Structures are given as structure tokens and as C-alpha cells.
mmCIF file of C-alpha atoms in Angstrom:
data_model
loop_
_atom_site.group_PDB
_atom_site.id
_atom_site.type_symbol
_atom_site.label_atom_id
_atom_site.label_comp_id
_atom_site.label_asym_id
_atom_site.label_seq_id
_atom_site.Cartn_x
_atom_site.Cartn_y
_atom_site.Cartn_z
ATOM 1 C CA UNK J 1 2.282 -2.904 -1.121
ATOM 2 C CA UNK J 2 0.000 0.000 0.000
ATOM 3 C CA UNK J 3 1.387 3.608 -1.115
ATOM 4 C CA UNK J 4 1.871 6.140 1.629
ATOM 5 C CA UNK J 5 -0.616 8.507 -0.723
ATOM 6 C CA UNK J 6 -3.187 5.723 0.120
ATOM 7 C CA UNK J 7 -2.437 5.581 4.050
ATOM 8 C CA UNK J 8 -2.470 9.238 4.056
ATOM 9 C CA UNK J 9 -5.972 9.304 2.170
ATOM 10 C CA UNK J 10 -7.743 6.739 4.749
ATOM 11 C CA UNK J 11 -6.924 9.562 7.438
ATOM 12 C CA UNK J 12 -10.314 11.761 6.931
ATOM 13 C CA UNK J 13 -8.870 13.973 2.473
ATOM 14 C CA UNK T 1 -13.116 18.204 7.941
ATOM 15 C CA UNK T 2 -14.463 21.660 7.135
ATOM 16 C CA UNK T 3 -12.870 22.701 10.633
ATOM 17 C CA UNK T 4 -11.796 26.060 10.159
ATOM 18 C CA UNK T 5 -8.126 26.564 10.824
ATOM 19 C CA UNK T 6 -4.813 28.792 11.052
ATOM 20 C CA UNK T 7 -1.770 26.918 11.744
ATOM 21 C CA UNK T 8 1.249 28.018 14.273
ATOM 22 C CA UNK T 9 4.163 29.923 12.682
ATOM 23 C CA UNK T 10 5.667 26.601 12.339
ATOM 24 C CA UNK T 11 3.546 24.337 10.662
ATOM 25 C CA UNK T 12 2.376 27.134 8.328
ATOM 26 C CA UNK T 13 6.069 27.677 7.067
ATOM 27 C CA UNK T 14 5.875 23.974 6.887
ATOM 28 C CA UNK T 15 2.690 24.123 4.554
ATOM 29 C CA UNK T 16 4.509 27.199 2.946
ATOM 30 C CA UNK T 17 7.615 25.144 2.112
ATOM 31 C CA UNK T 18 5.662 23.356 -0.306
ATOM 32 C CA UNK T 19 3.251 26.096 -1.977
ATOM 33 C CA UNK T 20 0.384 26.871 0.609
ATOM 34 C CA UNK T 21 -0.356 30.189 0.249
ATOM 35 C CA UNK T 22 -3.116 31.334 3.174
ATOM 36 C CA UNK T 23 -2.859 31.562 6.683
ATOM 37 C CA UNK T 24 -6.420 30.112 6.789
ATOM 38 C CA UNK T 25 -7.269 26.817 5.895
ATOM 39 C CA UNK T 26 -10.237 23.775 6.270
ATOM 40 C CA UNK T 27 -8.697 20.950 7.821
ATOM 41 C CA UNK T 28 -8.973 19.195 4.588
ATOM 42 C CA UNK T 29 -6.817 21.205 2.887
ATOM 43 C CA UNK T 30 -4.252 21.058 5.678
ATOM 44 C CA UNK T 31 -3.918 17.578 5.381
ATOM 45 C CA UNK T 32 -3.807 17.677 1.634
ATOM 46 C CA UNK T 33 -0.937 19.952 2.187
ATOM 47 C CA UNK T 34 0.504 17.961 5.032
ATOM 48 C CA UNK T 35 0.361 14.543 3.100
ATOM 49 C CA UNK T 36 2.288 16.687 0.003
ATOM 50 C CA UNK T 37 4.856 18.193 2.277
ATOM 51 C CA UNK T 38 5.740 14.235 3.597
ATOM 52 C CA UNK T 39 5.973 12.992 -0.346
ATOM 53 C CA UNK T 40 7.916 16.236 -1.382
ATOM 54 C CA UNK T 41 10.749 15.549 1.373
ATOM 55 C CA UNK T 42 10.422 11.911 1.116
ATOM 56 C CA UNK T 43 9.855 11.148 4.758
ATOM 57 C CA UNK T 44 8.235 7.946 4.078
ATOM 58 C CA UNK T 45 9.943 4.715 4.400
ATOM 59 C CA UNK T 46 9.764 3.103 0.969
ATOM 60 C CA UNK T 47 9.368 -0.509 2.031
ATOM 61 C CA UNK T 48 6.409 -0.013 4.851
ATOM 62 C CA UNK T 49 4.883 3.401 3.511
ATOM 63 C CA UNK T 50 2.643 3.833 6.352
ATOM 64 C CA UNK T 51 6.067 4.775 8.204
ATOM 65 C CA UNK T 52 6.892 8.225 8.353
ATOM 66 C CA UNK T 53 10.762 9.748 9.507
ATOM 67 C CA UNK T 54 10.915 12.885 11.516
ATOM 68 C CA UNK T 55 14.304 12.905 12.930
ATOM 69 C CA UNK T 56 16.332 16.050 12.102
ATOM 70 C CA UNK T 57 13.166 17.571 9.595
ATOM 71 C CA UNK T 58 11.072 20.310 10.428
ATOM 72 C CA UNK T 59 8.120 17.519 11.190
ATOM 73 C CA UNK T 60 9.797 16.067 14.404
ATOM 74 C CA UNK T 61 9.569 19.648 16.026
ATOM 75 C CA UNK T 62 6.268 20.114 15.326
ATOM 76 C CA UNK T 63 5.009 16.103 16.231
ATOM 77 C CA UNK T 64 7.889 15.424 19.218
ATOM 78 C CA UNK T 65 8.661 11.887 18.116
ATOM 79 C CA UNK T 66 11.243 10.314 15.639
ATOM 80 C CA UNK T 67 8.913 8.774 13.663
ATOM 81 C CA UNK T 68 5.309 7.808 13.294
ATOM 82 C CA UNK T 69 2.544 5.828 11.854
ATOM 83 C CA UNK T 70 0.302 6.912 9.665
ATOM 84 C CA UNK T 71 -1.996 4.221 11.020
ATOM 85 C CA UNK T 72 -2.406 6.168 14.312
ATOM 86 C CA UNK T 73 -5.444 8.059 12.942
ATOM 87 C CA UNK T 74 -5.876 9.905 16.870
ATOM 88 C CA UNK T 75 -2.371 10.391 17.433
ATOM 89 C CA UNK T 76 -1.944 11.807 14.050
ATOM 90 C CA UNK T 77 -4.597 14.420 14.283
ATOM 91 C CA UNK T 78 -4.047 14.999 18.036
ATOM 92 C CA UNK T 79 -0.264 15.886 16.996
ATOM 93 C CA UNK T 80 -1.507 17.817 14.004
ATOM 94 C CA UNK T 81 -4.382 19.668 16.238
ATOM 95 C CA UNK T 82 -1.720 21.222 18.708
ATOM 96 C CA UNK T 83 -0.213 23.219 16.133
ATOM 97 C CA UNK T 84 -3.118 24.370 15.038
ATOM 98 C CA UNK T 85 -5.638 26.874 16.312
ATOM 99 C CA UNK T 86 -8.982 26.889 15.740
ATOM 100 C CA UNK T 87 -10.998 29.681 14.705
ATOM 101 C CA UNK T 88 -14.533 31.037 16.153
ATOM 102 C CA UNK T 89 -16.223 31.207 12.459
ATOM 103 C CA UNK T 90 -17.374 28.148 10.526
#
């Protein structure tokens, strides 16, 4: 695998 | 997230360093911002991307810690929220 970009998405965009 | 927001001196230079431009922001833009500056400097580890280094960048003054998780929703935003000060308007 999962990107960092995705990870950072599942916070709240 | 429509939380309406201004950011200390330090996490708005942060936010500046890669192009933000207000000192007023929703709390989704901060974190589009925030999640930018991380790629930009290329403070992610690159095998286990959820793993974020602070050590010796701007980001471990403003969060305290050597590194972090981006899996820790809470302590994310409670580490984000304490540089940040929230306005009385929408």
C-alpha cells in the first residue's frame, strides 16, 4: 504494497 | 473536515515550504498539504509506507517523536491539532 498517498488518504482527504 | 483553521508559525512555514499560500485553511486542505509536504521531502519509508521519519526535519519539532505511523489516525490528528488553532467562524 500500500502507497503512503493511500495511508495518508484513509486519514479523513 | 471543514474545521476552520490557522496553523502556528511553524507548521504554516511547513505548509509554505511546499506552496500553501493562506494563513487560513479547512482541515482538509491542511492535510492535503501535510500529506504533500511528507511525499515532497520523502519522509516515508519506501518498504512499509505507512512509516513516516521525523528525525532532524522540520516535522519532528512540530510532532515530538522520531517517527510515526500513519496508522495512528488519533495520534496523528491529536499531533496535528496542537499546532493548530482553531478559529470562532465556521
Amino acid at each position: 504494497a500500500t502507497s503512503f498517498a493511500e495511508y495518508w488518504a484513509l486519514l479523513x482527504p | 473536515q471543514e474545521t476552520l483553521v490557522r496553523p502556528k508559525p511553524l507548521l504554516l512555514k511547513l505548509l509554505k515550504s511546499v506552496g500553501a499560500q493562506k494563513d487560513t485553511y479547512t482541515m482538509k486542505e491542511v492535510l492535503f498539504y501535510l500529506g504533500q509536504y511528507i511525499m515532497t521531502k520523502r519522509l516515508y519509508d519506501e518498504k512499509q509506507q505507512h512509516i513516516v521519519y521525523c528525525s532532524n526535519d522540520l516535522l519532528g519539532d512540530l510532532f515530538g517523536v522520531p517517527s510515526f505511523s500513519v496508522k495512528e489516525h488519533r495520534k496523528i490528528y491529536t499531533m496535528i491539532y496542537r499546532n493548530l488553532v482553531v478559529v470562532n467562524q465556521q
